[model samples]
Target: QRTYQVVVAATKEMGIGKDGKLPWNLPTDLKFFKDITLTTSDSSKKNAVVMGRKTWESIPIKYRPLSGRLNVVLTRSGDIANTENVVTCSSVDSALDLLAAPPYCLSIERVFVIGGGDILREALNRPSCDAIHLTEIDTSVDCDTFIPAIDTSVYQPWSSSFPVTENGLRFCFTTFVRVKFLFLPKMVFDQHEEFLYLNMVEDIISNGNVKNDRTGTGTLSKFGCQMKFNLRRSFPLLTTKRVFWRGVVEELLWFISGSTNAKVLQEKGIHIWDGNASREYLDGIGLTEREEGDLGPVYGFQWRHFGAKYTDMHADYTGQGFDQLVDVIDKIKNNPDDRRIIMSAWNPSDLKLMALPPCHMFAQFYVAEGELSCQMYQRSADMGLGVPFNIASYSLLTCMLAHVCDLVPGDFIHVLGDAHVYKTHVRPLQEQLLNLPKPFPVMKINPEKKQIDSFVASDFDLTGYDPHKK
Candidate 1:
């Protein structure tokens, strides 16, 4: 389960280019990249570099395959599959698969995805992408290509010494690592409570039944599984495979705003829902009239405006449905002893209008002894991809609610109905299970704002999370 090491030099906006080449050249930065890729500390093992076709061509013809490493490039289908030194694949996933398989994975010690925009995104979003060796330039430059926004929550500095300057452009060589579990002692764990996710997945695989799903991607699924995390001790964000913290925050905020548009997320460089927003998928789902990316009355809509009269996404949805987010927070403060602080997004009436039905469906909030706790229920949980995201998203929501209500965060109980490991995810999940969890990171929320919606991404600081590369 070796993770990809991404090497990129970009501006503060994460812009990586002006034309086909980098906007500004720093000789030291280039040399640093060379050193990272070429340095084979293990005499028997070699490294690999995967880049897009444009990036491959951007390098001089003489330094073509980049010396002393296996070069894998992404090109269009039917393009020369293999060059003299550079092997080409049609997609980023293919290039990574080639490296992970026999013959190459045997000799490769580290795999780096050196890229243009498209390839960088595919590689970065993958769970295998573990670390980013980013050279952050202080100034913004004119550019066509850009590096995607790095999820700061999942990745943190490898060292404090960075931000060096050269050629009048202040830059720094920063390395960010993916997180895993917290470093609490075994004695501190409630025995079965720790590694709850691990136990959850294991329960599904070992004892769950093989079942068919709506996506036609069959699964090994277990019904009725529950796990709890103690927020007072540590945040329960999974340290298994790398989960994008930025996506979680952005999507949750978008949901909180009751936005049904995917464009809102896309504008922020988050495309988690792009597949569902595509015209092809929309037409397939019989939503031909709905504008693109307008997920009809889905999670956010149901959360904010439950049982509201639904139409298209753009039409004014003001005062149409109940404001569950505000109502929940208000209830927590006004009536902490209320057992019915529940917010739901599963409107059966509007399910057909949605691009994709909500998986992590609803949440019940409870505040006791100055602590706010949450329990999230999922109808169908994709164990590999959607599960980790759901856990973090709801956990963040719980923490946000706690912040506004002046209460400490408590347990985030995840209860799944059809907890399944898709046929494809079995291997990756198995690989992740092999990873020994590190200490859970402590997240300190900046108390600058008391409003539920006022908190920005910068208001959270994550520290001490160390997980396996994959």
Candidate 2:
């Protein structure tokens, strides 16, 4: 669910320094790093790095995350390793704990310290940490100190910049997102969807699963698989699980309003958070002015802002001589087999303007003997905390689309592609999975097919639905 970043910054000739120390070390570059990374865009979170004793020894140690930041050190001894800006950890796990511990946990903050030799070596093996920043000198130097012999080819360049020369060493800097790991291989997903789902569910149910620190969702490939859906005539993922009456209504409203601002969400009491503190713009409409670190507009921001470039072509929404759900239903009633009935949520051009992007971005419509079936494509899914809500949200959408389109609820199939958990959120998910599925109740819309976009939150009447605890 997180990105593995690789940042490269080094003095070209000085990288392989006389004694392996960087050449022409730029203090300003370090400041720029603190400014950008102290509060990053990942989860709109921040991190101060952790390192081993030897790693700690590498730095002049003058700037331990340079105050105003977290600088953790790993040592076999529990005692604080240094008198200055570093905290000590008995082991790698302890180091993560000390660094990832509460207050700092949800604060959406973190510190990633550069490790030397042993520290960097162990950091690579740890899955919790994803990104790495390395300084390499293009021109080799003769020195006993060495950067680990890595398959540098695995990392892709992310950001590159040139630096001033001082010791005759040219310094070129570049950053990389572990492109290889960002997307789960498609074939692997196809092969193990069912198995992953079953395993995740089983583990979650059996109390063997871990919760992610970020989302507090169960950490399992299964939860990840739960994101994608395969529809035939009806949309599959049902909101019935938790009766996301509000989420469903909100999502639809968001689609129609086509506004990516938080005012709409705020009006509906759905404040996941966005913008400058609160807001002052005509009741918090438009942009929030962005807080210190905003991930931009995650889903809603992307959809509305990018909707134009990204066409809304749901077959159930529009058909030959018909563009409304009810009308589409009438057309489907007249002619059953329609393979051209498909909806798209992808607009490459829109990808540029989005603050945050759509994850469960697209869905497909299929008809079986006049029955409207659907399958959805979710580029990414957040299970545990989000799965039930997501399932209910889309399922309800399908039902409404089906009702207006004049169809019934069939198996709402899901086909998830890439699913994951925030490294920080593996515990809470396990606790949540312990709750039983409440056998989501079906939605029965009024006989008068209301306009999908026109229907308000108050329009849908929900009763007789019981969640395990809620």
Candidate 3:
């Protein structure tokens, strides 16, 4: 698509002009604007710069035509200086249309809308406007013109330059690109496992309410949400964004080993839990007595030793607490019909001792007709980042358990209590929703590895995992 990009320098208050003229003069910002509007990748073609009538007239007579570029001015009267490079149109659309056709279309390589506030506002709302190169001045100035606030939902920050100071004015250049839906060969949405996750995301964005959360990052959250994946068909690793497969494998193995140390994961280049287990994070959470990476009584501890006496991550409590994981495996092999085959990571008494309380509270196993299924309840779900990882982790666990217990893998049902999309993640998730998901990948567990605790990253193989770039 042939589209125009906007360029403007505004103050901290978003004031772009004062009495139809710039509020401040900075030569660096002027040079930046000139370089961006003049440079064309196609050496044979020139770039076009569009502006409102006021913006055109505001330029000094010496710089009226803006040199080496075609100037298209938006004016109602269609009257402007009679210059070979100058043209006039009634609106931004008319100017864009004129440039996209005939001799101009053949000669123009790129289009830039350098503007007054009103023109920038109008250009931003146009679908043909694909990017904005903004210079953000760090000070407020008296001005009569202002640009509309950029909609984060429709555009995302693409790149930015470090601050520069010139003539006592400090400013930084930043670029934003429009977030557009990608077109792909249409597939049956309902038949894809990814649709289940995508639908939840859509629902949360459309209907979830604003909520203040423990992380201090506000969220749009819904009370209860559920998604199911058919393990018999394929693994549920999300295809919209590349999931961290190595971290998922290593973290699960660490959990199965009943380790509550974040360092163990970090040692293997898995820092997913590093944030929660940092010394500063621990002290902030009132765990000043604990050392770094000591995640006490977290998922792993509760999975293997549910009610073990509290101790350091290095302490051994092999026989102190009930072994829930072993109990589940034993029940799956010996008593397939048992209703109590469950593992819980949400120990109420251990919450105070933990660096961070468990989000995935517990999981239950179901066996019927030589097939094993799992349903996990996560009390709080981070839909954008954490949920995908959780899905893959539990789904892989389901496959692993099925392999060891001599049963077919069935479904992995994820039930959430407070499913949320963080405010900071809203734009990226919105962009992800635009992507058409590919088929889920198939996971192969080594048949020779009969025990869950014995399996390493090499024991698993994922094939046909064609995921979108993150």
Looking at model 2, how many pairs of residues clash?
56
Candidate 2 local lDDT, 161-211, one digit each (tens): 333444564443333223222331122122222233334544544543344
Residue-pair clashes per candidate, as listed?
9, 56, 0
What lDDT would each prediction earn against the true structure? Answer: 0.77, 0.47, 0.83
Off by over 4 Å in 1: 1-194, 213-216
- Could you tell me the lDDT of residue 70 within candidate 3? 93
lDDT of each residue in 347-372, candidate 1, tens digit only? 78888888998888789988765679
Instruction: Record all residue pairs in model 1 with backbone atoms less than 3 Å apart, i.e. clashing.
Output: 180-239, 180-467, 181-438, 181-439, 181-440, 182-439, 182-440, 183-439, 183-440
Candidate 2 TM-score to native: 0.43
lDDT of candidate model 3 versus the reference: 0.83
Off by over 4 Å in 2: 1-244, 273-336
Which window of ten consecutive residues has the lowest lDDT sum in model 3? Answer: 180-189
**Clash pairs detected, candidate 3:** none
What's the true lDDT of residue 21 in model 1? 70
lDDT agreement of model 1 with the native: 0.77
